[PDB]
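[job 4471] stage=fold_predict status=RUNNING
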Amino acid sequence: MGSSHDHHHHSSGRENLYFQGHMPNDMEDHLLTVLSVASGVPKEEISRDSRMEDLAFDSLVVSELSLKLRKEFGVTGVDDELDLLETVDELFQLVEKHRAAGS
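[job 4471] inference complete, writing structure tokens
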């Protein structure tokens, strides 16, 4: 008497290892990957035409997003820019215009 055995596995069988990180031709792909790691959800679940929900619209997720951008694109100290995010496409256009600069 006294048992309720359940050994249910979620399953996360994944195996595909590449060294593909030289010459990020698609900035959009690399920025989408920044979002894919920050949000934790795959590339298909994030698009340019989308609103800032559980992607980059939360103080923790914005600090995580910034943390990525400092390394991935060198885009640092852009708190106001990340505060002005409404659409995901706007983030693509923002880092684009920020990389181009006024210099």
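[job 4471] summary: DSSP finds four helices and no strands in the chain.
[job 4471] exit 0
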